[PDB]
Amino acid sequence: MKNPQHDASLLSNSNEFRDKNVEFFASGGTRTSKFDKLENHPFLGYPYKRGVKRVIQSHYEPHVEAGGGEDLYGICIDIDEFSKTATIVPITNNFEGYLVAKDSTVKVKDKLIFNKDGALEKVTINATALTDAKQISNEVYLVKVAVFGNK
Amino acid sequence: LFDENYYAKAVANIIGEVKDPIMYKWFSPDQIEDVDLQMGYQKTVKWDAFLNANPTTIANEVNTISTIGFSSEVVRLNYLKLQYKFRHLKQTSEKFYTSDSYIGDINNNLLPFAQAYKLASSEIIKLINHFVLTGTVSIQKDGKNQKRLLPNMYGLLNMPEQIKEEVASGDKDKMDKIFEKIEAGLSKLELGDEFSTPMMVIVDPATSLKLVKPYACEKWEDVLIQTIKAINNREDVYIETSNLLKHKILIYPLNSELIKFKPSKYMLPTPNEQVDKDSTDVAHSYIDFVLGGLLATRKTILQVNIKQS
Amino acid sequence: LFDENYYAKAVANIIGEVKDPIMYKWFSPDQIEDVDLQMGYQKTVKWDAFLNANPTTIANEVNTISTIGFSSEVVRLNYLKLQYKFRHLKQTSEKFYTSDSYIGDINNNLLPFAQAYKLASSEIIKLINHFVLTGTVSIQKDGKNQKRLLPNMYGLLNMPEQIKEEVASGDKDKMDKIFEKIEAGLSKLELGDEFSTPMMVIVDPATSLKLVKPYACEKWEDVLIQTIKAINNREDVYIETSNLLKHKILIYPLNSELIKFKPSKYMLPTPNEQVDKDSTDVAHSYIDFVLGGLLATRKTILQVNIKQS
Amino acid sequence: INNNLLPFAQAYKLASSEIIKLINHFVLTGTVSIQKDGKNQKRLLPNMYGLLN
Amino acid sequence: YSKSMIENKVFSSCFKSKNERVDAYSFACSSYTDKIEEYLYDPANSFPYKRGVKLVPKENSIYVEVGADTDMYGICVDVCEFSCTAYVLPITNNFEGYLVTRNPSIKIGEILDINNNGVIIKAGGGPPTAINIYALSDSFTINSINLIKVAIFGNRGLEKT
Amino acid sequence: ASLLDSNFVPINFTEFVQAISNTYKQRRIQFYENLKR
Amino acid sequence: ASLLDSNFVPINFTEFVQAISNTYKQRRIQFYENLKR
User: Fold this and answer.
1) Residues of A in contact with B64 (CB under 8 A)
2) Shortest Cα distance, chain E CAs vs residue C25, angstroms
3) How far does CA B271 lie from the centroid of its chain?
């Protein structure tokens, strides 16, 4: 989850101001402009920090889910669990931030494509990696990218 | 002015004796609204709003929100100015014709100005009521020799784009067939979101006589009232009889959001300033009135005609 | 504030011209209680007491007395915040669009802020009424493209753990079968000791038309009212027709101890402080509202659905 | 100077002078353009003419 | 044709399905920070309202004319007929709203393409699509012009079939 | 300006016509007030 | 604090919204008072 709410018994020492932003709970983007377009959409699964595709079908309104390729619609940068909604930057808007990478093979200067699971994988091109893949926890890898569209 | 205009003084004195028009019973108080005009046309604009998409959930940051649109529609209404002339006795000549408890020449049918104006106003009010009910101007029981009127000037009976039903001459005396046609028209009625409103029915004496017959220990009138209550959200249903109709049934709601009457504020009779005078004791006066101003939405009036041949 | 915020001034001046919601007719005055919450969830705790044993007779000396216990139940209700955006003219630009007897561009469908807000508020109130009656949010006549809603957000029609009856498509026109299903649902209804309370019934226009038919000189509506009076201690029974329903019948009491509406005090439309402005004469404004807050006890609502296929 | 940025007063004065020159040109000639060649004219509404056209 | 399109003898007759109007607000979901541009359009060649348009630089001004997806500059969302001015949302911006189509039977979720007349058609016609267009609703006819709710988000990387 | 008001005194025929119209409007309002159905 | 009062002068937008809510509540109460089923 984006913010796993767990109670603790001791305070965690947090004084260093470096290597403190690369975390799974840091939503949004590293650099954001006031004129960035954001759309809230109903979601299924957990597409947080992943490429999202719009799935269209009691008939319900279209939703979004993790995906990519020819069906890529946008990037999920923030999530609200109570309302079960996801904030999405459309593919027509450039974005700079940390996204989920398939594995640790991604390095700097690498052109990256959103796979069927919304993860960034090496090689149409969609993003250019800025830093190396870093393991936040278990198999979760976060890579800083600057999305520019589709080739 | 009253020191100089005896006729104006008499009109102001006797204006209260004129009876109220009976057309007021056919409308709710909110449905009638006066306008300032004598002759010409006036355009009415109605505004509406609609939802373009599902409402947008406000959570975290968002800039794309659902929108609400607007629309407009223009309806033109025509107003016509009509006039009448009547003869009466000159003011200075009343003393020579004041008889025992009555004034005027019985032999020559001459009247004082006040009485003449009152009677003429009553007649003109009756004519205005006939026009409002039927949409035509005629002084004959047959309803012919109708004065030609402008378009966009309709009554409750001839308003276009409404539910017209016709009962064939073979079933002119079959209340079951008439009620079948009435049910068909009522089903075809379209009240939309304003269905919770009182309803008004106008019938002719023959129709009322047929209605008060037993239902083939219930009456056709009761059955019709129940049928109308089934659609008007169990609200008031009023029934009226008018001798101006002939084998016609009119059904319409008394709601200002569907049918609106916007008469000119000079519609009722008004004296004219010009008075014809000569060397004799007989003078002439003119009365003005204005016709037009009925407005209705589409498919909200049921007009049933029982053909006689 | 009114010296600076023309939009707030106009909202204050024209807030009174918005008609009251029709959903108030479906609830008693005591059944509605506002709460202070925009978005989130609220936990309501209901306390009860019970007798552990027979009472103790006080005679001579005794220390062992029967006890009275207590119990609690927690219910969680979800509230959702929704927003709409509409375009309108600017205050400094209205003077150049003030035409004769109207203001606004007929060609461009642009309206003054007050009129635009009034129309948008009316539409949003209609949507809120539809949600309260049905429990679903949609803008299409087919009822599709529904907005997915949070759990614990139910309407009268879709509230779970209530009595649900289904009339087969083959019996869609058999009022006897429909009334048999209604009687079965009423029998399954459980009001306990709160049975002495008025009852409310909501029906679709087709069912309203079927109800006024003769019973098979008595009406199906009369028989239904008598049957409900048999169970509700012969209290008042109200019948309502709504175009928001289709082949559905809703029966429920008006007792605040069984069904309670706890809406947010911001549920009805409210303007937002943010107004989009640019160098042109067109501005944008936002209206907020809140959905959710219906609570009901188990097995106290009868919902009859007449299948058409 | 290095970025061609002015105070609002001076910028407004210069822009107003330029717009006044353009208005004078439109009044005298009846056409609106920013080219010495006179081409790339802005299309205007009917019944909008100058002394020359 | 036109958008406003007239005196009526009588007024025209729930909240649902009232948006099916030719002169309805094009954006189903609007957003500030949406870029809108003004251009001239030919007043006798083709009416660009609710159609995909292309930039044609003429010898006197830059006009917008109805165009295909291959050379599309944006979507014409509104027109001011008094000044004959077209308002264009560039293709670089997202759009979700009602557009003119020529096929009266289009279902929801289908892939769509803009033809030479700036008209929504099914993407199976054969021309390689270059824009991401999806039908958000079934096509409806206003009596006659066919409209449909669509979502347009940028260009497609590789042209499809 | 209404003819029902005793203190009212018209100045010219235009004011007389306005008073007549106001009197008719007030009479219609009174009729709707007194009407019972 | 309601918008019905002529003497009520709101100070800020929060007070304005509270007044709107109070006006809605008062209108609901008045509607239920005047309702006769």
Assistant:
1) 37-40
2) 18
3) 22
Q: Chains F vs A: touching, with 3+ CB pairs under 8 Å?
A: no
Question: Is the separation of the CB atoms in E51 and E77 below 8 Å?
Answer: no
Residues E81, C107: C-beta atoms closer than 8 Å: yes
Q: Are E74 and E136 in contact (CB under 8 A)?
A: no
From G34, which residue of chain C is nearest by alpha-carbon distance?
A: C29
H runs (alpha helix) in B16-69: none
Q: Which of A54, A75, A92 to mutate to test the interface with E (most CBs of E within 10 A)?
A: A92
Burial profile B82-115: b = 16 or more Cβ within 10 angstroms, e = fewer: bebebebbbbebeeebeeeeeebeeeeebbbbbb
What is d(CA E118, CA E71) in angstroms, rounded to the nearest whole number? 11
Angle at A10 between CA A7 and CA A15, to 5 degrees: 110
Sign of CA dihedral B53, B57, B58, B63: negative
In single-letter form, the type of residue at position B299 comes to K
Cα angle: C286, vertex C289, C290; to 5 degrees:
150
For residue C209, count CB atoms less than 10 angstroms from its CB and return exposed for 0-12, middle for 13-18, buried for 19 or more: middle
Map residue G33 onto helix, strand or coil.
Answer: helix
CA distance A147 to A74: 10
Tokens of A129: 């990696």
* Residues in contact with C177: Cβ distance below 8 Å, sequence separation at least 6, in sequence order: C167, C168, C171
Residues across chain E? 161
Return the number of other C-beta atoms located less than 10 Å from residue F26's C-beta.
Answer: 14
Way the structure was solved: cryo-EM
In D, which residues are within 8 Å of E40 by CB distance? 43
The single-letter DSSP state of residue B166 is E
The nearest CA of chain C is from the CA of A21 a distance in Å of 29
Tokens read off for E37: 């541009």
Give B12 to chain F, closest Cα distance, Å.
7
Output DSSP code: residue C190.
-
Residue with structure tokens 């999405």?
A88
Between the CA of residue C277 and those of B201, C4, C283, E32, what are the distances in Å? Answer: 53, 16, 5, 10
Chain C residue numbers with beta carbons less than 8 Å from the beta carbon of B51 are 84, 123, 127, 139
B181, B184, B190, B191 alpha-carbon torsion, rounded to 10°: 70
CA distance B223 to B136: 32
Resolution (A): 3.3
The Cα of A17 is separated from the nearest Cα of chain E by a number of Å equal to: 34
Under an 8 Å CB criterion, which residues of B touch A?
54, 56-57, 59-64
Asked if chain G contacts chain C via 3 or more Cβ pairs within 8 Å, the reply is: yes
What distance in Å separates the CA atoms of residue B111 and residue B90, rounded to the nearest whole number? 9
Q: Do A61 and C41 touch (CB under 8 A)?
A: no
Structure token digits, residue C59 = 């005679």
Instruction: For chain F, give the number of residues.
Output: 37
CB pairs under 8 A between A and E: 47
Disruptive mutation site among C19, C141, C147, C241 for chain E (greatest number of E CBs within 10 Å): C141
Decide if E1 contacts E42 (C-beta within 8 A): no
Within 8 A by CB and 6+ apart from E82, the residues are C107, D45
